[PDB]
Amino acid sequence: SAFDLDVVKLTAQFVARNGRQFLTQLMQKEQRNYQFDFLRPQHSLFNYFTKLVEQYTKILIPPKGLFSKLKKEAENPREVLDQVCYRVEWAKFQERERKKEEEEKEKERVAYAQIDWHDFVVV
Amino acid sequence: QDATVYVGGLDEKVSEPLLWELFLQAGPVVNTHMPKDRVTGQHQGYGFVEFLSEEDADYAIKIMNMIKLYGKPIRVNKANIFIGNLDPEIDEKLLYDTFSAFGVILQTPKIMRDPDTGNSKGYAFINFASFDASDAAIEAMNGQYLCNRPITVSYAFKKD
Amino acid sequence: VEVKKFVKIGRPGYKVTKQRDSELFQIDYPEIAEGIMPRHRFMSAYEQRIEPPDRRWQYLLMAAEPYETIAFKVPSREIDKAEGKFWTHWNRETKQFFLQ
């Protein structure tokens, strides 16, 4: 699976340098008798190819290392510790929201299994 | 166990030489075994066919899969919701794909097997993500037409 | 048992509007001031309070806690899906219930 991953990485690297949505280096390759089944969204590898293209687009950011240098993440452990604490707090908030959604689903299942299903009215 | 193929879904018309005669076109079936019950004294629908080579058993498993033998879903294989009267031709991944249309599955499902053969017992247990998927399985899947086998979905544990 | 006995039933008049779509009913309900969404379920006509003859159809009924259940008979076998989490919606800002 190394050759398919390398082809997907090459397609994500060639598609990230495009100046338009449809005017890319991979749309013209489809008409140039080159078989590429990862371009269609019906395949399961397209969801990974989109994430690879998003990572290639995020690797081209101006704070990603092209024309600037990161100082907080590279020369401050306290900022990295604060970011890790904020990520842990966001994960705890997401877990609390998932627990609240599970409690709401359990309450809706308890309310649906206790209502009267014999009082039918056709208007 | 590798050269033998476990067949599931045999009716009363199928017999011990009948399975060897039906599996003779697939490969050289050397022996046929049918475990008899203790209360009824007959076959429980599951049997085994021991052939000479593993390629003949693989061809019999790939040829006689999900067949309609004696009005029964006969299939050969390599030897809180409860689902009963399920076909042995389906696997755990096939049951997970069939259960994915109603609701979301929490993990991989498991099917009960016999302690003697180990192919298919007849009942299975599957767990859903929430109670809405269990209610949709008890409303729609509890009585749906499966592969030549009327399944029945029910609740494993319920508190009044 | 505790939630079923404490459920108040005054049976108000509901307002359902059906529309034949192609690719959906809208039930106007008052403010319930609770997090419990109204649930829809498809049942058979075999069980009734008086058991009328020639009952061989199905009915999809939507029920809530402060309001009465509104039921619509479906003569067809399967033309849609009566699942709650699949093709239903309940906007609590406008209190509008939709099911398709």
- CB of B77 within 8 A of CB of B28? no
What is the DSSP-derived secondary structure letter of residue C82?
-
Distance CA(C29)–CA(B134), nearest Å, equals 28
Contact across the interface for C84 and B139, Cβ inside 8 Å? no
Residue B142 burial (10 A CB sphere; 0-12, 13-18, 19+): middle
Q: How far apart are CA A58 and CA A113, in angstroms?
A: 49
Task: Look at residues B87, B86, B76 and name the one whose alpha carbon lies nearest to residue B32.
Answer: B76
DSSP class of residue B8 equals E
Chains that touch C (3 or more CB pairs under 8 A): A, B
Task: Compare all CA atoms of chain B with the CA of C42 and give the residue at the minimum distance.
Answer: B139
Q: Is A96 on the interface with C (CB under 8 A)?
A: no
B132 touches chain A (CB under 8 A): yes
For an interface test with A, which of B128, B131, B160 has the most A Cβ atoms less than 10 Å from its Cβ? B131
What residue in A sits closest to B158 (Cα-Cα)? A113
The answer, for C55 touching chain A at a CB cutoff of 8 Å, is no
| C25 vs C84: CA distance, rounded Å | 14
Among B45, B116, B110, which residue's Cα sits nearest to residue B79?
A: B116
3-state secondary structure of B74: strand
Which amino acid type is present at position C70?
Answer: I
Residue C84 touches chain B, beta carbons under 8 Å: yes
Q: What is d(CA B33, CA B15) in angstroms, rounded to the nearest whole number?
A: 10
Residue with tokens 């403010």: C31
- Cβ B153 vs Cβ B83: under 8 Å: yes
Between the alpha carbon of residue B83 and those of residues A25, B95, C10, the distances in Å are: 52, 11, 40
Tokens of B151: 């399944």
**Residue C27 burial (CB count, 10 A):** 22
Q: How far apart are CA A9 and CA A15, in angstroms?
A: 10
Distance, in Å, from the CA atom of B105 to the CA atom of A106, rounded to the nearest integer, reads: 17
Place of tokens 């599957």: B126
Q: What is the DSSP letter of C9?
A: -
Q: How far apart are CA A115 and CA A40, in angstroms?
A: 47
Kindly list the distances between the CA atom of residue A53 and the CA atoms of A18, A58, A59, C71, in Å, as whole numbers in the listed order.
11, 9, 10, 50
CB atoms within 10 A of CB C25: 17
Contacting residues for B33 by C-beta, under 8 A, at least 6 apart: B16, B47, B48, B49, B50
Nearest to B6 by CA among B37, B45, B38, B39: B45
Nearest chain A residue to C51 by CA: give it. A118
Cα–Cα distance for residue pair C83/B102, rounded to 1 Å = 9
Which CATH topology does B81-155 take? Answer: Alpha-Beta Plaits (3.30.70)
Burial of B158 (C-beta count, 10 Å sphere; 0-12/13-18/19+)? exposed
Q: Which has the closest alpha carbon to C44: C61, C20, C26, C27?
A: C61
Tokens standing for residue C6: 């404490």
Residue C28: phi, psi to the nearest 5? -90, 115
Using a CB–CB cutoff of 8 Å, tell me whether C83 touches chain B. Answer: yes
Nearest Cα to B23, choosing from B58, B2, B91? Answer: B58
Closest alpha carbon within chain A to B129: A102
Residue C73 at interface with chain A, using a CB cutoff of 8 Å: yes
Strand order of the β-sheet with B123-126 is B110-111, B123-126, B81-84, B152-155
Mutation for testing the B interface, residue in C85, C86, C87, C90 having most B CBs under 10 Å? C85
Q: Does C42 touch chain B (CB under 8 A)?
A: yes
CA distance B33 to B20: 10
Tokens read off for A62: 């101006």
Q: What are phi and psi of A4, to 5 degrees?
A: -70, -35
Residue-wise DSSP of B93-128: HHHHHHHTTTS-BSS--EE---SSS-S--SEEEE-B
Q: Cβ contacts of residue B85 below 8 Å, gap of 6+?
A: B122, B149, B150, B151, B152
With 0-12 / 13-18 / 19 or more C-beta atoms within 10 angstroms meaning exposed / middle / buried, residue C64 is buried
Distance CA A30, CA A33 (A): 6
Alpha-carbon distance B16 to nearest alpha carbon in chain C (angstroms): 43
Size of interface B-C (CB pairs under 8 A): 12
A42: burial class by Cβ within 10 Å (0-12, 13-18, 19+)? Answer: exposed
Resolution (A): 7.1
Q: Do B139 and C41 touch (CB under 8 A)?
A: yes
- Number of helices and strands in chain B (H, E): 4, 9
Alpha-carbon gap, residue A55 to A66, rounded angstroms: 14
Task: Give chain C positions within 8 Å (CB) of B103.
Answer: 85
Neighbours of B59 (CB within 10 A): 18
Return d(Cα B40, Cα B44) in angstroms, integer: 9
Neighbours of chain A (3+ CB pairs under 8 A): B, C
**DSSP E strand stretches across B21-100:** 29-33, 46-51, 67-69, 72-78, 81-84
Within chain A, where are the H helices?
2-15, 27-30, 46-58, 77-112
Tally the C-alpha atoms within 13 A of residue B111's C-alpha that lie toward its C-beta.
Answer: 20
Please report where in the chains the tokens 């011990």 appear, as a residue.
Answer: B16
Distance of CA B123 to the CA centre of its chain: 9
Cα-based distances in Å from A84 to A65, A70, A73, A102? 22, 17, 11, 27
Helices (H), B23-155: 54-63, 92-99, 131-136
Residue type present at position A11: T
Q: Collect all residues from B whose CB is shorter than 8 A from any CB in C.
A: 102-103, 130, 132-133, 136, 139, 160
Decide if C84 and B132 are in contact by the 8 Å CB cutoff. Answer: yes
B132 closest CB neighbour out of C1, C42, C85: C85
Q: Do B132 and C42 touch (CB under 8 A)?
A: no
- Confirm or reject contact between C41 and chain B (CB < 8 A): yes
Q: What was the experiment behind these coordinates?
A: cryo-EM
For residue A48, give both structure tokens.
């990974």
Cβ-contact B64, B78 below 8 angstroms? no
The closest of A68, A57, A44, A59 to A15, measured between CA atoms, is A57
